[PDB]
């Protein structure tokens, strides 16, 4: 199936408490694999998945140098934005960037992207054509103009189409045992009483990978998706994921409800009752 390489970058200023905190977290699909945190003792780029042990020391040295350079750039960005927005030097502000690429099963580029946010709102983003930027406000328009005059989109395009794709291919090759695996969900249903003669049926799905999954509750063979509560699919601390979805039903009618689980590791969806 398709795979992706994504980096989540954050710079957060802390007036009166030193330089901004800078962090970089990289992912191949739903698996964290690298990280840089300026807040550590002697910050360096570090492996977050076992297969990254296959990279030599030069990988870590070069990525650490890049991260430090990146850290300085965003520190400068934070200062620059204070000016664009006419803000005080004593408030904390945040810059976020999502950057990466996606390839198909054959390893060819499907799409590249890079989007910036300032204080949690859209700032600037590369368009799908990988040739132009879209600015969310007038401040971002200053950046768009600088970037256009500096040939920044051309530079980024080269990274997305080249470096990003090639490294993603390498990571999928080196970490195939982890990244190309499928861990099948194991389900179970819990029951909890409620006032007014009702009960909560909660369908759980645990130990699965990848993260993509579908949980539905049905009655009369029709999905109840609407009056059901749930949590977003979440990491379980060991590279796998879990999720639950619930529905409130009348006491004594529980047997009429079935939970359905659809996942890449379930040749036939799971059907469960309480």
């Amino acid at each position: 199936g398709p795979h992706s390489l994504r980096y989540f970058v954050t710079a957060v200023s802390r007036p009166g408490l030193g330089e901004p905190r800078y962090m970089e977290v990289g992912y191949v699909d739903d698996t964290e694999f690298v990280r840089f945190d300026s807040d550590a003792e002697n910050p360096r780029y570090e492996p977050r998945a076992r297969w990254m042990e296959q990279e030599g020391p030069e990988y870590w040295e070069r990525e650490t140098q890049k991260a430090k350079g990146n850290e300085q750039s965003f520190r400068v960005d934070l200062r620059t934005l204070l000016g664009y927005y006419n803000q005080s030097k004593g408030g904390s502000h945040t810059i976020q960037v999502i950057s990466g690429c996606e390839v198909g099963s054959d390893g060819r580029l499907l799409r590249g992207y890079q989007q910036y946010a300032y204080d949690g709102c859209d700032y600037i983003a590369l368009n799908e054509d990988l040739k132009t930027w879209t600015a969310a406000d007038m401040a971002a328009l200053i950046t768009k103009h600088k970037w256009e005059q500096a040939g920044e989109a051309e530079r980024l395009r080269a990274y997305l189409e080249g470096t990003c794709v090639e490294w993603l291919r390498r990571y999928l090759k080196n970490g195939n045992a982890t990244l190309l695996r499928t861990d099948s969900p194991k389900a179970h249903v819990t029951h909890h009483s409620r006032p007014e003669d009702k009960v909560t049926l909660r369908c759980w799905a645990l130990g699965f990978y990848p993260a993509d999954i579908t949980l539905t509750w049905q009655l009369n063979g029709e999905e109840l998706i609407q009056d059901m509560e749930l949590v977003e699919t979440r990491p379980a601390g060991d590279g796998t994921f879990q999720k639950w979805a619930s529905v409130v039903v009348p006491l004594g009618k529980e047997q009429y409800y079935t939970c359905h689980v659809y996942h890449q590791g379930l040749p036939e969806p799971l059907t469960l009752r309480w």
């Binding site: 990525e63 890049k66 750039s73 965003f74 980024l156 990274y159």
Partner: peptide, 8 residues
């Protein structure tokens, strides 16, 4: 590998 960011 990560991208080398410049500035806004």
């Amino acid at each position: 590998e990560q991208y080398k960011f410049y500035s806004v």
